[PDB]
Coordinates of C-alpha atoms in Angstrom, one line a residue:
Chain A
X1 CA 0.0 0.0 0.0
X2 CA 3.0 2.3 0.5
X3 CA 1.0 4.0 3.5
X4 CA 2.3 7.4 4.7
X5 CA 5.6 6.6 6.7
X6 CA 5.1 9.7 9.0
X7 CA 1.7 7.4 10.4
X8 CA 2.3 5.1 13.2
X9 CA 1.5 1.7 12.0
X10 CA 2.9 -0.2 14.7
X11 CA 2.0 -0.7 18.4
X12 CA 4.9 0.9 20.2
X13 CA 5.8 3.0 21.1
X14 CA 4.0 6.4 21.7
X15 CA 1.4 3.7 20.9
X16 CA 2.9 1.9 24.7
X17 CA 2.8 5.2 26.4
X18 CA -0.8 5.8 25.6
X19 CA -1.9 2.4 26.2
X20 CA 0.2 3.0 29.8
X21 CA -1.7 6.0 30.4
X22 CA -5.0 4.7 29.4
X23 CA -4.2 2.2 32.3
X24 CA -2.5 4.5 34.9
X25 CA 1.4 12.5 36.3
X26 CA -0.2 12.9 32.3
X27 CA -3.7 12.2 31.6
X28 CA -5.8 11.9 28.1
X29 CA -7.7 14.9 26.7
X30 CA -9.6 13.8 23.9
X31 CA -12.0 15.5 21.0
X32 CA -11.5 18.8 19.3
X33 CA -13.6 21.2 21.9
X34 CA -12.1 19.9 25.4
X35 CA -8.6 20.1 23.6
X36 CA -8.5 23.4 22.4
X37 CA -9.9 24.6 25.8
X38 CA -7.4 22.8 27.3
X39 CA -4.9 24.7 25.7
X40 CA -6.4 28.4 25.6
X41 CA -6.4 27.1 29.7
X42 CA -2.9 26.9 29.7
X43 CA -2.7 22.9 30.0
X44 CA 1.0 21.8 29.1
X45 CA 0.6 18.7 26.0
X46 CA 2.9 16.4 25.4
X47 CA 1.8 15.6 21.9
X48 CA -1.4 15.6 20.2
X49 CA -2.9 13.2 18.2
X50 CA -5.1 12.3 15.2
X51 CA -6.5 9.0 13.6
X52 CA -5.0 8.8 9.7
X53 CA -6.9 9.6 6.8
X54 CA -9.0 12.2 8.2
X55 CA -8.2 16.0 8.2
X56 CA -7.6 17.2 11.8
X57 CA -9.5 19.9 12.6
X58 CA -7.9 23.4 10.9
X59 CA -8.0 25.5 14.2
X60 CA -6.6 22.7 16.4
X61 CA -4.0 22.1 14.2
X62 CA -3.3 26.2 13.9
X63 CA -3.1 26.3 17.4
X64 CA -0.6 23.1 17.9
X65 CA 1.2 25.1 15.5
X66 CA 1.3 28.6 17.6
X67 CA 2.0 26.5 20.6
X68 CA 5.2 24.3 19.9
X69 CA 2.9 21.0 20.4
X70 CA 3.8 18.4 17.7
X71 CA 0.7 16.7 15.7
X72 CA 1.3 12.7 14.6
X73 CA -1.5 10.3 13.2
X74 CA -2.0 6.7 13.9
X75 CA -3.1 4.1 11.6
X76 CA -7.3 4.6 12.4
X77 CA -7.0 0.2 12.8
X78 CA -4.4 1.4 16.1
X79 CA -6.5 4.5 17.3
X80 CA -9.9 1.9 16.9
X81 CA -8.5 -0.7 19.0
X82 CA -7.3 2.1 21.5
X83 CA -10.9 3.5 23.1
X84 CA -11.3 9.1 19.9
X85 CA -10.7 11.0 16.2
X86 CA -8.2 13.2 18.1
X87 CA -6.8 13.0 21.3
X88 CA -3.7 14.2 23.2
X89 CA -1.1 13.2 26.3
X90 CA -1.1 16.6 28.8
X91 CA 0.3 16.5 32.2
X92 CA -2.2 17.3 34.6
X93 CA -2.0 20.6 36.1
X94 CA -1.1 20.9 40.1
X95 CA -4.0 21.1 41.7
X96 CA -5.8 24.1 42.8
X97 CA -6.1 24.7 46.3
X98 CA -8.6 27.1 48.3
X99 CA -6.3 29.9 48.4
X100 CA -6.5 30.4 44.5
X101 CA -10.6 30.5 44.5
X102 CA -10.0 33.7 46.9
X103 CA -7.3 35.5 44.9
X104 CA -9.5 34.7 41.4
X105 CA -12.4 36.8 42.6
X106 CA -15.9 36.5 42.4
X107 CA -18.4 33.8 43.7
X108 CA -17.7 30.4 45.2
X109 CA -19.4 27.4 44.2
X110 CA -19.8 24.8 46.7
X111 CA -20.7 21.4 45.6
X112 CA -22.0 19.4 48.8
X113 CA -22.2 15.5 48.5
X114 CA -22.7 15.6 44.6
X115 CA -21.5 12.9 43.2
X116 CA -22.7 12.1 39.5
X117 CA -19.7 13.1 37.5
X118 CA -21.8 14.1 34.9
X119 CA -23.8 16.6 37.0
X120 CA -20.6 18.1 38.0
X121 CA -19.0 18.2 34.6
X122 CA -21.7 20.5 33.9
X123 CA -21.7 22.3 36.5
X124 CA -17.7 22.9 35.8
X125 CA -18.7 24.4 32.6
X126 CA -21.2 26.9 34.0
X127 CA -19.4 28.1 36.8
X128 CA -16.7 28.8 34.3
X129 CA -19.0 30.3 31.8
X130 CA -21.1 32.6 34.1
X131 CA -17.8 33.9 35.8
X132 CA -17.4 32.0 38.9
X133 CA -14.3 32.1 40.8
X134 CA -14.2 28.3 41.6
X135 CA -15.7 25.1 42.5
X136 CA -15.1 23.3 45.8
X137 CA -16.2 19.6 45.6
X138 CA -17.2 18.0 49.8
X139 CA -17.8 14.9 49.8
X140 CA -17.8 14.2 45.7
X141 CA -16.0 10.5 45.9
X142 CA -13.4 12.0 43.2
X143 CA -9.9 10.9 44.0
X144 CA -8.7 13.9 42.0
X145 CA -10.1 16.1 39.0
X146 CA -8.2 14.5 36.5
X147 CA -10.4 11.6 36.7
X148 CA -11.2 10.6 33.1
X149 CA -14.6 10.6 33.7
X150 CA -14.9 15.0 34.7
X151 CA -12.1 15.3 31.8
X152 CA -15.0 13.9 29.6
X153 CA -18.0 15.5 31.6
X154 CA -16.5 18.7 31.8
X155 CA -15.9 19.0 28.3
X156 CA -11.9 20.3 29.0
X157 CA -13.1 23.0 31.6
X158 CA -12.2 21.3 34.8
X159 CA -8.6 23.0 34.6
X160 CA -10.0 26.6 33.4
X161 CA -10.7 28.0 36.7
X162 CA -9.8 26.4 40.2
X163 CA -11.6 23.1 41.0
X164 CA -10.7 22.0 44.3
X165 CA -11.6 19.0 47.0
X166 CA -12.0 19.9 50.5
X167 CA -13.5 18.1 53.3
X168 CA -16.6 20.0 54.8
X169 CA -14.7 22.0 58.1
X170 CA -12.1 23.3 55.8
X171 CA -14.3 24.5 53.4
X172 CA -16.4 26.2 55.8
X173 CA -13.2 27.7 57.9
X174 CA -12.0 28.9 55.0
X175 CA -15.1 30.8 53.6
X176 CA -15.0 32.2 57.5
X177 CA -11.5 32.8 57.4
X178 CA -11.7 35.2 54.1
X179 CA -15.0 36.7 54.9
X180 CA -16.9 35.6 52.0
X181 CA -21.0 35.0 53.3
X182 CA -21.9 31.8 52.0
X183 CA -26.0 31.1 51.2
X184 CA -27.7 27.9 51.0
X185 CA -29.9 26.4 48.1
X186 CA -32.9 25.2 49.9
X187 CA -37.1 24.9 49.5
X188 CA -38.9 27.9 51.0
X189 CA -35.5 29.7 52.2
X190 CA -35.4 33.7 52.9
X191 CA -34.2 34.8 49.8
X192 CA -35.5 34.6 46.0
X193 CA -33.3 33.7 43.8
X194 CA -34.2 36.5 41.7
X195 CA -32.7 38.7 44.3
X196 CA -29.3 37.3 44.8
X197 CA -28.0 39.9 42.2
X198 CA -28.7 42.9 44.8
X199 CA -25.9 41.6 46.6
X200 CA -22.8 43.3 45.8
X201 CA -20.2 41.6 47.6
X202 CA -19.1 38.3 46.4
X203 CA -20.5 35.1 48.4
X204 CA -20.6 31.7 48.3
X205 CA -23.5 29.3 47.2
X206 CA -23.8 25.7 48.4
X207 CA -25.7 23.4 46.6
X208 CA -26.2 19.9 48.3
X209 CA -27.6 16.7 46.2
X210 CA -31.2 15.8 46.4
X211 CA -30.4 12.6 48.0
X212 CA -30.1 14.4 51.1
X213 CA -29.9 18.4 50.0
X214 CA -26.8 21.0 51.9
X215 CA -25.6 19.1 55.2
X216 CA -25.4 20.5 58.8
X217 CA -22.3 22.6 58.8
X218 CA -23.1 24.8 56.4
X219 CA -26.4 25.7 57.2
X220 CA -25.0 26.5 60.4
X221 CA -22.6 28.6 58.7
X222 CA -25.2 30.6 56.6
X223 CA -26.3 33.9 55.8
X224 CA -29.3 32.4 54.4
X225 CA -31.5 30.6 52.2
X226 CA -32.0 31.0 48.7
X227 CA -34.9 29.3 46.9
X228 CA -35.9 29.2 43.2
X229 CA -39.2 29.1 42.8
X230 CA -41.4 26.3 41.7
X231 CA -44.8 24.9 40.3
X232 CA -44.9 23.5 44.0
X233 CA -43.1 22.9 46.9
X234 CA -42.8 19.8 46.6
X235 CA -40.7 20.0 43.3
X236 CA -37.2 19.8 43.1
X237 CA -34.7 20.6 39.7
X238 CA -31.2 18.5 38.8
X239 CA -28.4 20.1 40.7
X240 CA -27.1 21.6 37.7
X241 CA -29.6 23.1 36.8
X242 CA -30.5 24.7 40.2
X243 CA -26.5 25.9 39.4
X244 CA -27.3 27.7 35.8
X245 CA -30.0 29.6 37.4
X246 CA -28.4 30.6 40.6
X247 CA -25.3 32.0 38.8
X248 CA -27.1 33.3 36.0
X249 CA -28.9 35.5 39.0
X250 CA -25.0 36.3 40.0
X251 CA -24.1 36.9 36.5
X252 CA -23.8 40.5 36.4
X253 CA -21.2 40.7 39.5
X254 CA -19.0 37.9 38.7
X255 CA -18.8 38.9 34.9
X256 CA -18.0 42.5 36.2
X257 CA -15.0 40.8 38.4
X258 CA -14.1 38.9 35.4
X259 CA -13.9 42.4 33.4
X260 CA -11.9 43.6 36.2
X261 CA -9.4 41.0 36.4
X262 CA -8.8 40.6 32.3
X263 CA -7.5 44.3 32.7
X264 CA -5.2 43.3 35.5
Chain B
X1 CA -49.8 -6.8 52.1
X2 CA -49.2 -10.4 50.9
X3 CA -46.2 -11.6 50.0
X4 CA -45.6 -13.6 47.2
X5 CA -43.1 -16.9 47.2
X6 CA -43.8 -19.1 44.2
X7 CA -43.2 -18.0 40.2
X8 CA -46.8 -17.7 38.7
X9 CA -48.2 -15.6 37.8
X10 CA -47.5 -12.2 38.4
X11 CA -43.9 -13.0 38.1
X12 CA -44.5 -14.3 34.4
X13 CA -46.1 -10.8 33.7
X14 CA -43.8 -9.1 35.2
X15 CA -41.7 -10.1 33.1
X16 CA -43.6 -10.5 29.8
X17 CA -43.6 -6.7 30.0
X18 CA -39.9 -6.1 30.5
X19 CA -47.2 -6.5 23.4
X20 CA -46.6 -4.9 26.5
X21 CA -46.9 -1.7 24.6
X22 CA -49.7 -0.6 26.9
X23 CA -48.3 -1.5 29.9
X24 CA -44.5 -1.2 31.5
X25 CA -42.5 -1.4 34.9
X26 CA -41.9 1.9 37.2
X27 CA -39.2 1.2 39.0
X28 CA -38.6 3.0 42.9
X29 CA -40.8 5.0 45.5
X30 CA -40.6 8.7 44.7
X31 CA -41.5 7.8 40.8
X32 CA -44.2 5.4 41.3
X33 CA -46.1 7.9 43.3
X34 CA -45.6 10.5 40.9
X35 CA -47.0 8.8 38.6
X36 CA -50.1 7.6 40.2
X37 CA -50.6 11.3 41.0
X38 CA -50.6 11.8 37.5
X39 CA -53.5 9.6 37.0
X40 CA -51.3 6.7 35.5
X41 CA -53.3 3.5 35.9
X42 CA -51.4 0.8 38.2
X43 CA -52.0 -3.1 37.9
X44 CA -50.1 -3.4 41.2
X45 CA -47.6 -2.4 43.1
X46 CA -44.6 -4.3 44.8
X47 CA -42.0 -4.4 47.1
X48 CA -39.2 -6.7 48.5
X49 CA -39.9 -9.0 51.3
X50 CA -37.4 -7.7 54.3
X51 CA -37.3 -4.0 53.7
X52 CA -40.9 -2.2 54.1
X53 CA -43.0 -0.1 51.8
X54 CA -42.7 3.4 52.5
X55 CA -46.0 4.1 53.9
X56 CA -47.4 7.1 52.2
X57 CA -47.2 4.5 48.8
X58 CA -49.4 2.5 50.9
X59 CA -51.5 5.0 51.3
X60 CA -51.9 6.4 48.5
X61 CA -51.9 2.9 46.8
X62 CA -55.0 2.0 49.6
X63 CA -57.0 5.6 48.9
X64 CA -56.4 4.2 44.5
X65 CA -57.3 0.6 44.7
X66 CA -54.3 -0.5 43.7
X67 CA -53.3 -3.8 45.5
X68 CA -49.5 -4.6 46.7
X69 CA -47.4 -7.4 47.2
X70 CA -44.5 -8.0 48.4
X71 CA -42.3 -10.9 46.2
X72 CA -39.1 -12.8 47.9
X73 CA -36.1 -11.2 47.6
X74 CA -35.0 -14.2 45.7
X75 CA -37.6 -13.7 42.9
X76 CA -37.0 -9.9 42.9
X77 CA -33.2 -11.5 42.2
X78 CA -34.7 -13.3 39.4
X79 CA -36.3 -10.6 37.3
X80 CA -33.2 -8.1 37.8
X81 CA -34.9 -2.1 41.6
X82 CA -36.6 -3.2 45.5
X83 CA -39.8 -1.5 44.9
X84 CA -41.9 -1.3 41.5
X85 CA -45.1 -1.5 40.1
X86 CA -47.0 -2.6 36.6
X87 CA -49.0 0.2 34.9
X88 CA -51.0 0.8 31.6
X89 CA -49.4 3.6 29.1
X90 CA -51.5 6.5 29.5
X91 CA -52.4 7.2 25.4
X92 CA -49.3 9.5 23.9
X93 CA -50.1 13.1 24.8
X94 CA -50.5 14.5 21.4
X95 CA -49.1 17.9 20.3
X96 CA -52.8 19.8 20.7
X97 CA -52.5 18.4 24.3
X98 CA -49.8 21.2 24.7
X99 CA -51.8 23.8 23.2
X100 CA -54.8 23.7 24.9
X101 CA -52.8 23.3 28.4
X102 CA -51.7 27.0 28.0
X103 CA -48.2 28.6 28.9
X104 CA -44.4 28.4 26.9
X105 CA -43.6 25.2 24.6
X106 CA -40.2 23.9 25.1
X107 CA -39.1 22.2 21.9
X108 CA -35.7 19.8 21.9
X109 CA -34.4 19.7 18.2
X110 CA -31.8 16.8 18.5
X111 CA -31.3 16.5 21.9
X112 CA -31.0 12.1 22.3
X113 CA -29.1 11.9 25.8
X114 CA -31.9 10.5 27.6
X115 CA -30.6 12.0 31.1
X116 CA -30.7 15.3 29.6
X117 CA -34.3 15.0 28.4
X118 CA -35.1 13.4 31.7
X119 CA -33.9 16.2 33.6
X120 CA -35.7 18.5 31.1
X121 CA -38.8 17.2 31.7
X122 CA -38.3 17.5 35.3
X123 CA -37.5 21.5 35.0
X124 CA -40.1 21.9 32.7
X125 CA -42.6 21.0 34.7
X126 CA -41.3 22.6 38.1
X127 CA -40.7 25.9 36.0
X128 CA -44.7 26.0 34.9
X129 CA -44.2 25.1 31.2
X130 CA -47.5 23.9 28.9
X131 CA -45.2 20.9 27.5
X132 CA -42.2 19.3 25.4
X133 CA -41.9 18.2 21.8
X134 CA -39.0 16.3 21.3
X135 CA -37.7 16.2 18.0
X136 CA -35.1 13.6 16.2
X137 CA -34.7 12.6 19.9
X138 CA -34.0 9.0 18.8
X139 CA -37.0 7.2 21.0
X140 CA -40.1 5.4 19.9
X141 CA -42.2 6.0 23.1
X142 CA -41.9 8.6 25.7
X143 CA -42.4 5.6 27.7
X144 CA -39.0 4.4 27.0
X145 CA -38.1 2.6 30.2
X146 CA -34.4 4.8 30.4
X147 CA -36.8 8.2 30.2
X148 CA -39.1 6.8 32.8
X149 CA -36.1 6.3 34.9
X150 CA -34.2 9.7 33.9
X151 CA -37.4 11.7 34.3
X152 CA -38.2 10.2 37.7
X153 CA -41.4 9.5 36.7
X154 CA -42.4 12.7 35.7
X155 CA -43.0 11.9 31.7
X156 CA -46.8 11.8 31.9
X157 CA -46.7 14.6 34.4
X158 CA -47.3 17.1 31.7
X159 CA -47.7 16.2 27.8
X160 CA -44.5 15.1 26.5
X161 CA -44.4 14.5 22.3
X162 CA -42.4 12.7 19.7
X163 CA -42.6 14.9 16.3
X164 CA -40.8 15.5 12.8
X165 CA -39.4 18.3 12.9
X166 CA -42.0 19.6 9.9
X167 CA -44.7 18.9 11.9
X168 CA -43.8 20.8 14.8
X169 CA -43.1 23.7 12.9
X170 CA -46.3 23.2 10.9
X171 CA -48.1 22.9 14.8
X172 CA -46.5 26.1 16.0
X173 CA -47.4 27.8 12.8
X174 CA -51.5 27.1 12.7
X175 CA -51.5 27.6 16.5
X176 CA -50.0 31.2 16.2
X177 CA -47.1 30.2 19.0
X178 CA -44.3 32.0 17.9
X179 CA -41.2 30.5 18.4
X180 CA -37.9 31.6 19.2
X181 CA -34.5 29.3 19.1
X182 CA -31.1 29.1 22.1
X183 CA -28.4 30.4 20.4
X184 CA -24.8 32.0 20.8
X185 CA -24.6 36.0 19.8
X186 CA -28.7 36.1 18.7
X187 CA -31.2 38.8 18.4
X188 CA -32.3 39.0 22.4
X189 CA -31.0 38.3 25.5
X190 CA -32.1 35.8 27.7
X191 CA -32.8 38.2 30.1
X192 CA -35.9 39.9 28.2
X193 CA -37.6 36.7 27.9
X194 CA -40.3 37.8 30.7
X195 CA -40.8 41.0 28.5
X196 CA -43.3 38.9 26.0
X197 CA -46.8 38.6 27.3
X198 CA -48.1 35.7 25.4
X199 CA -47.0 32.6 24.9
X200 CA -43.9 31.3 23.0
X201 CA -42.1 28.0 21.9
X202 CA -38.4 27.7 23.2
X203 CA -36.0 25.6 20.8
X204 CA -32.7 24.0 22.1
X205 CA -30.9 22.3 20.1
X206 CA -28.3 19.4 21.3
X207 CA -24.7 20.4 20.9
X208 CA -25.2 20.6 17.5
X209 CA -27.2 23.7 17.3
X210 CA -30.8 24.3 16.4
X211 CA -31.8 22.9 13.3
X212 CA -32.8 25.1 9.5
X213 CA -36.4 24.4 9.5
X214 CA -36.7 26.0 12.9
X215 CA -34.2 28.8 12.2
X216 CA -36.4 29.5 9.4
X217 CA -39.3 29.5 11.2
X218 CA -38.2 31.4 14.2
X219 CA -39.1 35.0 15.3
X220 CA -35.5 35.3 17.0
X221 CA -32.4 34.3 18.3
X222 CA -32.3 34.0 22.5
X223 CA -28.8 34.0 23.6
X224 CA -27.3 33.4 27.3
X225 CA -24.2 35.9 28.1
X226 CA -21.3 33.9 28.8
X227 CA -17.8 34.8 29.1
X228 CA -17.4 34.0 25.3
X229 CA -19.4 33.1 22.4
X230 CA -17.5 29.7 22.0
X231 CA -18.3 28.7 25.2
X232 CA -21.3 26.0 25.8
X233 CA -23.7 25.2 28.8
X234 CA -25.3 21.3 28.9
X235 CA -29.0 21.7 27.5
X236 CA -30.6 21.0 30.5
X237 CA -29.0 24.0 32.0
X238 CA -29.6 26.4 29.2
X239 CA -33.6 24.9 29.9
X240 CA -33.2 26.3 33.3
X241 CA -32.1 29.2 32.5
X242 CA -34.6 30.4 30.1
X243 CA -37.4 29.1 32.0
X244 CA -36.8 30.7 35.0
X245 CA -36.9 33.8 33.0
X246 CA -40.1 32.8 31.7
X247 CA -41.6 31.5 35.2
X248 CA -43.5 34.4 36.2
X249 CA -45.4 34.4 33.0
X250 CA -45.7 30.4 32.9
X251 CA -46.8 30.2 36.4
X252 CA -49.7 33.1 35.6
X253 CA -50.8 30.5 33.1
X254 CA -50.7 27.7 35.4
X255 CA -52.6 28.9 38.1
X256 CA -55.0 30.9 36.2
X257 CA -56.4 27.3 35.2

């Protein structure tokens, strides 16, 4: 066949330290979107990666080229025997800690006993959309946020603004400890969410699962209750969603911290 | 509440059903009563010898006449969640059933991630709205059993409908329901969605995108501000979002009737 020698036809040996990675500090970021995101985030590649005889997608490639991040293609049979069209080895980021949510600016999203990775894939990409400062994940199950699994649900965002694990007492001493008011997502609480914009001061919003809602320390901790409201009260929306609308409420202060700090 | 040790013959119909086209399996507490709420009629109800029925299913299974059983764990075993129940499929809502209703239509145009539509359904009716047409959503029934399960039992809570995409155009046209589609950098902001008096249809597409038909058809693009225009929320958060916005009006609509 006289098939393109720059292809990898074989099985090592980038091949071997794919497969290696595929079964355990790098990770796998694959598909055109979460890699280019990845990137513009400032993620460090080690090489990127398409499957031969299709054209990799102009604007990744453009940036692979502005960045010094070599391209190579392997045979489609190898890359279909791995596992997606594109894919690439990064190392994974060191992981945020508190500290940076705080220095960011803006609100805090506080994720209490979710644990579907999908629901807080999404919720990675809202908060990073509607201008949060951060995420911190009590009591998620994740061993870290490079699991495969938020890479994928998080479409690439999960290293664009600080994601962070803390057990329930830190989170809440360090909310205390930096003076940032922190409001719970609850049925019938004080607050509409409609009026969580009047607020001018950043806070923090808690959001617990529905398979037991925001646990005892917080609510001890709060400033107050925030409810969106429903058909009737006996209702209840997915996490994420309860996420979109609560930061789209907070939308015009963090995107006005966001304006701030681009010009910093 | 008997309990049942053998393997006739509610076990064999059990699991004949999972044509059993008119009748299916709703699996768990919370969902099975929301759907006898919604008038869905139950065969019967069970649950696993060992661990007890929750007892407001009892009672609202006592106040319908719907009997209960428990089976042996071992059986339960057999046909496999702990508690469940046999029902008939309501007849499929059709797309007049969201007109008459009143209040906003939300429209999926290719959204086929069954937890996303589940989820959708949820918000949609919490947030007041009239219904859902699914477009190219890849089911055959809104009974799918993975929907059932997604939407927590909350698919025959308000009229959920499978269409072409030409028909629901065609539906939205003759019923004067102007419709408007989720998009990046559009005509209007999500923000003035509460402006609009009347009624509207809401169009997400899955991402990707809103299809041409309904582009063509629409009356304008809604977008949601973001940091930046390539940016991307899941679908059942953008639903949210533009439903809370339309609440106030949905919720006038809902308890007007």
């Amino acid at each position: 066949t006289e098939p393109a020698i720059i292809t990898n036809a074989s099985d090592p040996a980038v091949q071997r330290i794919i497969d290696v990675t595929k079964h355990s500090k790098t990770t796998l970021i694959e598909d055109t979107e979460p890699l280019m995101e990845c990137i513009r985030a400032g993620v460090q590649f080690i090489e990127v990666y398409g499957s031969s005889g299709t054209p990799l997608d102009p604007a990744l490639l453009d940036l692979c080229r502005q960045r010094e991040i070599p391209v190579r293609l392997i045979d489609v049979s190898i890359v279909n025997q791995l596992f997606a069209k594109v894919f690439g080895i990064a190392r994974v980021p060191r992981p945020a800690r508190l500290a940076d949510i705080a220095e960011r600016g803006g609100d805090v999203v506080v994720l209490d006993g979710v644990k579907i990775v999908g629901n807080i894939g999404a919720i990675v990409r809202t908060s990073l959309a509607l201008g949060a400062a951060g995420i911190v994940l009590v009591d998620s199950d994740l061993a870290t946020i490079a699991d495969r699994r938020l890479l994928r649900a998080s479409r690439g965002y999960v290293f664009s603004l600080p994601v962070v694990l803390a057990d329930r007492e830190e989170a809440v001493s360090f909310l205390r400890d930096n003076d940032i008011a922190l409001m719970v997502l609850d049925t019938d609480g004080d607050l509409g969410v409609k009026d969580l914009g009047d607020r001018a001061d950043r806070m923090a919003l808690v959001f617990g699962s529905e398979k037991g809602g925001p646990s005892g320390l917080f609510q001890e901790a709060s400033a107050g209750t925030v409810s969106i409201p429903m058909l009737s009260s006996t209702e209840s929306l997915n996490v994420s969603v309860s996420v979109g609308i609560a930061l789209h409420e907070r939308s015009a202060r963090n995107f006005a911290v966001r304006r701030a700090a681009a010009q910093a």
